[PDB]
Paper text:
To gain more insight into the mechanism of substrate recognition, we soaked or cocrystallised various nucleosides with PaTrm5a and determined the 2.2-Å crystal structure of ADN-bound PaTrm5a, which shows clear ADN density in the map. ADN is recognised by a fashion virtually identical to that of SAH or MTA: the hydrogen bonding network of the adenine ring involves a total of six residues and two well-positioned water molecules, and is further stabilised by the hydrophobic interactions with Ile214, Phe191 and the adenine ring. In PaTrm5a, the OD1 and OD2 atoms of Glu213 in motif 2 form hydrogen bonds with both the O2′ and O3′ hydroxyls of the ribose (left, wheat). The main chain of the Val244 forms a hydrogen bond with the N6 atom of ADN. The general recognition mode of ADN is conserved between PaTrm5a and MjTrm5b with minor local structural differences. A pairwise superposition of the Cα atoms of the ADN-bound MjTrm5b and PaTrm5a gives an overall root-mean-square deviation (RMSD) of 3.0 Å for 211 out of the 333 atoms aligned. However, the RMSD of the D3 domains between the two structures is as low as 0.89 Å (over 100 Cα atoms). The large overall RMSD of the former may be attributed to the completely different D1 position of PaTrm5a, which adopts an extended conformation in all four structures. Compared to the ADN-bound MjTrm5b structure, D1 in PaTrm5a is displaced as far as 80 Å.
Trm5a from Pyrococcus abyssi (PaTrm5a) is a newly discovered methyltransferase that catalyses two distinct reactions in tRNA: the N1-methylation of G and the C7-methylation of imG-14 at position 3711. The structural basis of the bifunctional substrate specificity of PaTrm5a is interesting but currently unclear. The 38.5-kDa protein is composed of three domains: D1 (M1-P60), D2 (N70-S162) and D3 (K163-S333). The four structures of PaTrm5a reported in this study all adopt an “open” or extended conformation distinct from that of Trm5b.
Residue numbers in the entry: -15 to 333
The structure:
Amino acid sequence: SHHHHHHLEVLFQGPHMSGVKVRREDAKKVLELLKSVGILDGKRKAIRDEKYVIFPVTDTNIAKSLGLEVVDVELPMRPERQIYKNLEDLLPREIFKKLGRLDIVGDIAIVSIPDEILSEREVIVSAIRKLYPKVKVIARRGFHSGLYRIRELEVIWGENRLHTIHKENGVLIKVDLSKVFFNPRMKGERYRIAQLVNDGERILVPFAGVIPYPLVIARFKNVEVYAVEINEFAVKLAEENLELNRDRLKGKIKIIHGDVFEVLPNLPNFDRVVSPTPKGVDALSLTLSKAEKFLHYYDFVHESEIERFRERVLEECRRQGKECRVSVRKVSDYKPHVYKVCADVEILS
Ligand SMILES: Nc1ncnc2c1ncn2[C@@H]1O[C@H](CO)[C@@H](O)[C@H]1O
């Protein structure tokens, strides 16, 4: 006596060799459809030409019951190994070129996605998820808003949170991107100055945020750092960060919750001042006034204004009766024709 047909029908060992041929304009719809009905073959790649897309299917009868055109095609197997090293490898150039720079903060990936390629959201996420399998949050970014310069962010994939712990230069940085400002790309800078700093210095860091700069400096050198931040949530996270990194800091950090322009005139002077100035803000005079040996003044300057920028720094140096050497460095490419720069000011004796 024999087997039931509805038991036999699943015994075939061969691979699926067919697919469905659809117009490109239908391709997303159909993909969804195939996934929903449950006949989408994950083992094979989809291919396309200039007019049509072909999706691999696991049941051609059901495919025909969906009114789709069944074709016999040898489709590429899915890759098992992964050799992509950057996002451009995982996206068409027309999509990738409109994307902003991708940033990783802890287990959060942040990318800017213009409205015109927003329909392609799902491939973008996919690519990101493929490049960074460890991240658990993908958020679309806008601009910085308000006095605290908090980045506009919308979670578009993963856990519905914008808080995490970021590892940098040997320190741990608790961050909440919905409540505080933070830029990971300053890593280099923060390390650099940390290496320049000598033991015994008194250092001032205005606009300190969740104190990544004081944390790195104090991580590598036995110094005292004053940090000034006006955002109380950032202050809170800064305290938690100070407590989190306490047993790995050589230096000391004093956190001051307040307005830089109010606090600094009531502070004593320092050996070194490090000013991660908010974009558009001019704190040159005030930060220089608190520096006795070195100022590191960050700013955003247009390509054709660098010279003028340097000149103005020198002017301020003369204005405060200081004799200085001024060096201007391009820290990063901020947007076209616009650089994030740093004025290294050596105050001479
Ligand atoms: N007058 C200010 N005083 C102290 N911190 C400030 C001031 N303006 C901006 N910030 C902080 O500087 C950081 C970088 O812009 C942010 O955390 C922001 O809240």
